[PDB]
Subunit: 209 residues, 3 copies
């Protein structure tokens, strides 16, 4: 049964996420009608029962399209530098594999910043960091860390351009509007819904003491 | 429940399409067994209830493989040139967002020509025009308009080659066999099932007055 | 209903495969929780009822991730070198198409070697041969044959690197550990779970008469 009533509406990550090893920021949402499942299944292979695994961390004011996925569990027990990539350690039904060593290796957390737009069916590899403000094109295969405000696409994903000038990006990284009190975001809404980064920064300087 | 009985058979677009904002030509079909849904769900985010949206237009004698998708609704309410890509205007459950502006922007219709082969899990971005005779490889991410008779593939999709010489393409674009009366298509079937473009054009000149 | 109980466990190919035109080696498995179906549906368009079609052959000690697919049935009745790519021969419901010729062309078997790791949602095109020891990255679109021990990724897929030196690859191709009696694999398990290719080859020379 589809978790979603409509392709024209998602649901807050904070409302649907049940895996303890996913941490999500305010207002971020997943719109998953075309793939049926809620967001937890987007975090593939993420054990929910222990601290000693790579975690998935998502910032605030993120938009995540249908069927995006975040590949967890590191190398999933496969070490291609070993003679075989086959996970003998994980097939203990076979007594002949009893002397196997565990190939599992962590990749580090997957960290998605604030104000990140993730297109439908993008797939983020293990251990990837995505900076604030990035745009991940639909169907991107994200194999490398993504700089703040980068627009990327492709398989493998490559940076196409940045959303703003370096000077504007510096202003945004300084003001961190995604952490403002809600009443300031409410007041700033006309500027947030605009290309006027300099004006948004001017408001930040006005209210921030 | 799967809309399709078999992976070895599709169904005519004209028989399955119910969205009023999808227009389809004769004999074009969708073979969707491996993704379950009928063709309407291939047109993602396509509002069915109004005239003032981008429409999906598909020509005649097109073949569409399983899970191909056509991304509609323009930018879906996200403007990356604005300070935030987050669609505040669409989260009016939050009163703090009441002053938001609508970021929505149309992309233009998605237009698929005649005699177009679309491979399984190709994904066509908003506003894309695909010329007559094109071949869209499986898993293509189509980010730019496609020339008539181009064979393309990849993510992002790139033109690999064309199906015919420029001279042969000129003959095909002149004769427009996909608009012939059915009795002419019936008579031309041996030539249509052949590489004899010059002969097909000769038949067109014979019957077209 | 999901064929799989868990994303953390697959099932042996030998246990789940029912299509007579799929041949699989020992211990190879498919972990398909995120796409629901058992492995047979991974082999798209593979007729089960006759000898005169391209077959899917998979070696031993292969690991196949969720939603990987192997596109069978050659050109599926579409010949882009003909005037139309539309499969008139397959729409005999329309009497006007009765003079159509069958465009179907075989591509040759799809052959996956031993000790091959196939990432989730990789898609292998018709007729492709993948050498022993290869690693197929997640979401690869595999359009060309893959050399033994190549690590590939992308759409279209490209070779990134090889797993071992040419000298080490030569040792592995000579010893063919994937065909050893199980008692030798059991004894060699510490070396198989290691980067010590030279030591594994030394054990092979010790026991092989
Ligand atoms: O969920 C939301 N938007 C997503 C797009 O990110 C939703 O799927 C959607 C798509 C299209 C659209 N439209 O055509 O205006 C509106 C919402 C907002 Cl309601 Cl928060
Ligand atoms: O036991 C579990 N996971 C273990 C680590 O505790 C690991 O992922 C695993 C998977 C399969 C397996 N096996 O085939 O027996 C053993 C451990 C469950 Cl919590 Cl998924
Ligand atoms: O994913 C893409 N486009 C989507 C289609 O749903 C749409 O055009 C879009 C692109 C960017 C965006 N953003 O920068 O926030 C929002 C929607 C391309 Cl960037 Cl690959
Ligand atoms: O406009 C500004 N301040 C005015 C008073 O000069 C007021 O405080 C204000 C701030 C923000 C705003 N907004 O984000 O829409 C509107 C008015 C600064 Cl951005 Cl210069
Ligand atoms: O639907 C049709 N063909 C699609 C391929 O575009 C169908 O999925 C199919 C696939 C393979 C095939 N074969 O092996 O001959 C026949 C039909 C025709 Cl019946 Cl109109
Ligand atoms: O009301 C609808 N769509 C509106 C435009 O009329 C637009 O897509 C939309 C989506 C979500 C929304 N919201 O969160 O309240 C508001 C409008 C339904 Cl027809 Cl999908
Ligand atoms: O999609 C592709 N191949 C499909 C696999 O189902 C098949 O080989 C095919 C290719 C082209 C085609 N056509 O030009 O009409 C028909 C089938 C490659 Cl072109 Cl990426
Ligand atoms: O073959 C041709 N005309 C013959 C008579 O000369 C006849 O009219 C015809 C036309 C088309 C055809 N076909 O498409 O198979 C067969 C015969 C022209 Cl293509 Cl030169
Ligand atoms: O099926 C198996 N492994 C696959 C990975 O190839 C399974 O999906 C899996 C994934 C992650 C994992 N982990 O976190 O350790 C264990 C098994 C082994 Cl149990 Cl044979
Ligand atoms: O009859 C079958 N397949 C035939 C070859 O025997 C071929 O794939 C096919 C598909 C569709 C079709 N049709 O539309 O009538 C005819 C043959 C079934 Cl076994 Cl799938
Ligand atoms: O598919 C990939 N990574 C997977 C994510 O599940 C994982 O990092 C992995 C990569 C290689 C591998 N191997 O060489 O056997 C095993 C797991 C990249 Cl190689 Cl594209
Ligand atoms: O270690 C070796 N032989 C020892 C005796 O010298 C013994 O036969 C053995 C072989 C393999 C092995 N293993 O794969 O772990 C352990 C001991 C050869 Cl690899 Cl040099």
């Amino acid at each position: 049964k589809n978790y979603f009533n409509s392709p024209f509406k998602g649901e807050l990550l904070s409302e649907q996420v049940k895996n303890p090893n996913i941490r999500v920021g305010r207002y971020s949402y997943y719109s998953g009608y075309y793939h049926g499942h809620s967001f937890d299944e987007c975090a593939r292979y993420l054990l929910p029962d222990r601290e000693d695994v790579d975690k998935l961390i998502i910032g605030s004011f993120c938009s995540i399209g249908s069927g995006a996925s975040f590949i967890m569990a590191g190398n999933q027990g496969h070490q291609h530098d070993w003679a075989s990539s086959f996970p003998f350690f994980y097939m203990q039904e076979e007594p002949a594999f009893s002397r196997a060593l565990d190939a599992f290796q962590r990749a580090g957390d997957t960290v998605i910043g604030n104000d990140v737009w993730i297109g439908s069916e993008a797939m983020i590899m293990p251990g990837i960091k995505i900076g604030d403000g990035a745009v991940i094109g639909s169907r991107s295969l994200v194999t490398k860390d993504v700089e703040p405000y980068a627009i990327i696409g492709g398989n493998p994903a490559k940076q196409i351009k940045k959303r703003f000038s370096d000077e504007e990006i510096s202003l945004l990284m300084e003001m961190e509007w995604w952490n403002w009190p809600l009443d300031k975001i409410k007041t700033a809404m006309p500027l947030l819904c605009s290309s006027n980064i300099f004006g948004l920064h001017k408001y930040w300087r006005e209210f921030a003491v």
